[PDB]
Amino acid sequence: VYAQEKQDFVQHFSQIVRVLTHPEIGDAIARLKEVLEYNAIGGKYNRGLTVVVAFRELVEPRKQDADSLQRAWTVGWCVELLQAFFLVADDIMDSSLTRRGQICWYQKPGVGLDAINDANLLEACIYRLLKLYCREQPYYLNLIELFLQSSYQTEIGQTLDLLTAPQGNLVRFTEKRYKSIVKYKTAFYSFYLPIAAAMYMAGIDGEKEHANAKKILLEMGEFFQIQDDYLDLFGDPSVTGKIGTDIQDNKCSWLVVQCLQRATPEQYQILKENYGQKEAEKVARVKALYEELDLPAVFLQYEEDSYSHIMALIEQYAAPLPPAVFLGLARKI
Amino acid sequence: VYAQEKQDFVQHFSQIVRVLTHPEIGDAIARLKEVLEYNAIGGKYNRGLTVVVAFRELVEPRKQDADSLQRAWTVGWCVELLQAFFLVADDIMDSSLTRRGQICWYQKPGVGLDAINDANLLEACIYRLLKLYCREQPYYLNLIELFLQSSYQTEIGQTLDLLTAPQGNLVRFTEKRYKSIVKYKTAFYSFYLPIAAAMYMAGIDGEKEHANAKKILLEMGEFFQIQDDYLDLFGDPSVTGKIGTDIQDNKCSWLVVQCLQRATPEQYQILKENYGQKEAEKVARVKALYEELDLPAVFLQYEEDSYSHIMALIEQYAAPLPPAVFLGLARKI
Ligand SMILES: CCCCCCCC[n+]1ccn(CC(O)(P(=O)([O-])O)P(=O)(O)O)c1
Ligand SMILES: CCCCCCCC[n+]1ccn(CC(O)(P(=O)([O-])O)P(=O)(O)O)c1
């Protein structure tokens, strides 16, 4: 369902770019095209695809005219632009090397900290497109506010992610703190935002229905981030497209949280000695310790429980939305 | 006029902060307060003061109730928040040392590239305040769009500023290119944005009146930036609150543009040899060359001409707005 729509979705990118690209600003405009091609393409498009898939499922085919669809995939691309924005900036703050199987944009020769302006340009495009295509829709302001509220929450999440991981400083790494981080940093924008966008486009804007969708989608977001933490250490970089940094960057990863919960006092010291340091020998020691306490299998356990819990939540809260809206998304993770 | 209102304006900051500051996000919220106190305070408040001053002058005192005023100084602070946002980020991209008489936020021990998330948080506050105080006004969407359009233009301006100044690369430094840079990078947000904000709050939203105000305000913006370039080299850092970087960072400064226009072929080589390099000896050689061609006096000449031109423009385009709106601003620069 996602898999079949992916093609139409990716083709519509060329138009996004033509519409986004005053002879005086020529060069700046050419640099925008380059920023977009490099940073908006190459991912799985889960998030933007979710807008289009959920739109199809919530609007009657008789209301799905050609113009109506154009807008659904534009808002789909706005969500991808948000993602591209957050990624370019997070890679600098995380000192990451690769993203989506290539060098991070800031690590390119001749880019560096200019990437900061590039990232924000990507964010400015969302609102240019919203104006271009939705300025006369009755949901226009709802969408604008949704995308803004979603950036604020996710920047709040980052702050928490950064404050909990000072460079060159474990008591801090609790369950309560972790859940809080992943809720703000990932769950609102990766999960609530795309479904809610499609809800407002389908004329569904009751508070109750948004909160019920939210209940489902925040929990899916939390699982997704825990998966992200797992793959940071135990995923194949040939598949993920990115090299992990979590132990080096002293992060409140799900892995470190579970570990702590499990560790003999001596094991606690091994972690204390080695965590949050750039030395490959010390990172390997931490990885060995995670393997010593079967955290890959604890992760496979958690993944199953949480999937059951998400399914229970869909059964409780999907009505009156088609459950397929949610099942389709959960199956893709 | 600016000078008397400055006090009420700065006091209202405490409320901005209380209103901006979910027990789980506590720490993130405390970090926001810190970001605000450090980065929103310490400047001249020209831009936010302009909102309040122009508001007073365009609304009848009978429509200036207490609530009406609260909103004018909130939007005033939104413009200052935009400024604080742009500054925190520009200091990183410019590798600057001080701002407003203290260490740049990113150069503080324990901050560094986290400053990227801090800056964007400052931008998120604008829209939180807009919702808090103006969500029921008929100008609400006009203001939202104005602040967004103004960030896009100013990020476009940055791109141009950065593309024209590659690290470790003069033919590029033309008049046409310079005017273009300063129009986007400074003129929309520092000059058009605050007056237009107050126009929309006073119910004045005709296209013609906005364009006429724009004609005046873009030219004031251009002069202001040329002044900014001059003070970067020939200003007292005890007064400016900031150390210059323009020659080091290989910038299309007004100074370098004029110089080029004036230089013997041999002088052109001295500039080529020394420009855009971190070496203090080479920066001093460029400064000596600017003094050799009396650019401080050329600047004092240009300042006078341009002031005449701005005054001619007010005489042509102020109607039906009070000319004092513009004169007050021009006198403060
Ligand atoms: C401008 C302020 C916006 C900052 C954007 C924060 C978005 C939250 N977020 C979720 C995931 N990622 C990417 C990761 O780096 P990973 O994709 O594993 O690289 P992470 O683990 O740091 O969370 C970022
Ligand atoms: C996130 C993308 C937003 C980037 C913000 C660009 C704002 C334009 N602008 C105007 C003035 N400054 C400050 C200077 O550094 P100066 O105050 O002399 O330091 P500049 O000379 O570089 O122009 C910045």
Ligand SMILES: [Mg+2]
């Ligand atoms: Mg991160």
Ligand SMILES: [Mg+2]
């Ligand atoms: Mg990660």
Ligand SMILES: [Mg+2]
């Ligand atoms: Mg700059």
Ligand SMILES: [Mg+2]
């Ligand atoms: Mg300057």
